């Protein structure tokens, strides 16, 4: 057998490079400068704030979980 760590859909929670608080609330899809450009909808659990994340800097997820909680 084997195991690995790949990306997850909406509902992922991890420490992103900026604050570390936020859960992926969805994905956004729009057209900027006449070109298709996707974004990540990150809701900041701190106060219910919203911070957009352009995939241009991300390249995959940019998130890393440190919650070492197991059985």
From TrEMBL:
<protein>
    <submittedName>
        <fullName>Transcriptional regulator, CarD family</fullName>
    </submittedName>
</protein>
């Amino acid at each position: 057998a084997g195991h690995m760590q790949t990306s997850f859909k909406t509902g992922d929670k991890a420490v992103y490079p900026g604050q570390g608080v936020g859960e992926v609330m969805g994905i956004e899809h729009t057209e900027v400068a006449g070109q298709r450009q996707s974004f990540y909808v990150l809701r900041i659990l701190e106060n219910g704030m919203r911070i957009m994340i352009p995939i241009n800097k991300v390249g995959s997820v940019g998130l890393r979980e440190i919650i070492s909680e197991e059985d």
